[PDB]
Design a protein around this ligand. Structure first.
Ligand SMILES: Cc1ccc(S(=O)(=O)c2cnc(SCC(=O)Nc3ccccc3C(F)(F)F)[nH]c2=O)c(C)c1
Ligand SMILES: Cc1ccc(S(=O)(=O)c2cnc(SCC(=O)Nc3ccccc3C(F)(F)F)[nH]c2=O)c(C)c1
Length: 288
């Protein structure tokens, strides 16, 4: 009879793309060092289906060059091992990922000079990827979250501009509809859902990296600012754990942060809760 349930951070960038997987335990402030990724990647995304952690997309900036990733890989906490899955139809660096009933949606991202609007869906039961309706906008550095079985694609960069627009995908209809635009332009923001709201934290606006955080209320169709983070960050990892938002690392324009913060909505306050064993940006985070 033991515990508990952890925040997994996979990959990222500091000096090069990274293979790190570490897991953070909020109940005691400890980090476990786990099996490396089969291949190092930054700007991947993380999610969790069926107890298993997945690492989607990204790119390997290495001494041997730059290779964008179409890869999907599955990590099992019980065996501390990673397995390849079927690859996506196109490489997707700086990708957003969302989960709906055990299906993983990969949105946007880039391969070289291509900025994707394409979106595709992964079915773990049968290990197959299927294309769905492309987004209305080309988006890399896109934040993605799921709320009442709708997928939201938020922020990003289209090839020319950094975006404050956002769009929502209806699976029943297989179509995308534009929602209210954010108050701020954000590419590389951390986006997640919590208590029936979509939060967008940090990112990059075309000039600076941001400390600011806004949330969208589906009922009112409005974005409202909340307390900002202590630190400015772009390419931060983000997740929810026990009624709380954690953000991990990111780049503030000088430094690759090891800072990890924690937002409590009931008090609307952020606090520093720990440090990653090293500073880094562009990680995939997820909880299981
Ligand atoms: C091609 C491209 C355009 C725009 C974005 S983007 O989403 O709009 C964005 C997000 N975050 C930043 S943080 C500041 C910074 O120095 N960037 C920088 C500096 C040197 C080399 C590469 C980059 C970076 F890949 F973009 F990071 N900057 C961006 O342009 C990104 C991620 C890539
Ligand atoms: C939206 C987004 C997604 C992912 C990332 S990221 O996954 O963190 C990443 C990092 N880096 C690169 S290019 C390699 C490079 O030299 N970076 C570098 C080197 C020195 C100083 C500053 C930077 C940079 F600001 F971080 F770019 N590309 C990324 O996607 C970033 C930076 C933004």
């Amino acid at each position: 009879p033991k515990v508990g349930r952890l925040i997994y951070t996979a990959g990222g960038y500091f000096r090069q793309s990274l293979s790190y997987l570490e897991a953070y335990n909020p109940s005691d402030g400890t980090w476990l060092r786990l099996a490396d990724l089969q291949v190092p990647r930054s700007g991947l995304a993380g999610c969790v289906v069926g107890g298993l952690l997945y690492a989607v997309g990204g790119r390997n900036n290495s001494p041997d060059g730059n290779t964008d990733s179409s890869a999907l890989d599955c990590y099992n906490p019980m065996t501390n091992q990673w397995s390849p899955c079927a690859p996506m139809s196109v490489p997707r660096n700086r990708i957003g990922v969302g989960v709906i009933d055990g299906h993983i949606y990969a949105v946007g991202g880039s391969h070289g000079c291509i900025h994707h609007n394409s979106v595709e869906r992964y079915e773990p039961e049968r290990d197959e990827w299927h294309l769905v309706a492309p987004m209305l906008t080309r988006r890399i550095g896109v934040g993605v979250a799921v709320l009442n079985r709708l997928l939201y694609a938020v922020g990003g960069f289209d090839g020319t501009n950094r975006l404050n627009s956002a769009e929502c995908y209806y699976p029943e209809r297989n179509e995308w509809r534009m929602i209210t635009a954010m108050n701020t332009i954000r590419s590389g923001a951390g986006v997640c859902v919590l208590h029936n709201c979509i939060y967008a934290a940090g990112g990059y606006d075309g000039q600076d990296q941001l400390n600011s955080v806004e949330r969208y209320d589906v009922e009112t169709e409005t974005w409202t600012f909340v307390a900002p983070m202590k630190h400015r960050r772009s390419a931060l990892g983000i997740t929810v754990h026990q009624g709380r938002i954690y953000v991990l690392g990111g780049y503030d324009g000088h430094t690759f942060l090891d800072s990890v913060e924690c937002y409590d909505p009931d008090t609307d306050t952020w606090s520093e809760v720990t440090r990653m064993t090293s500073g880094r940006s562009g990680v995939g985070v997820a909880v299981t």
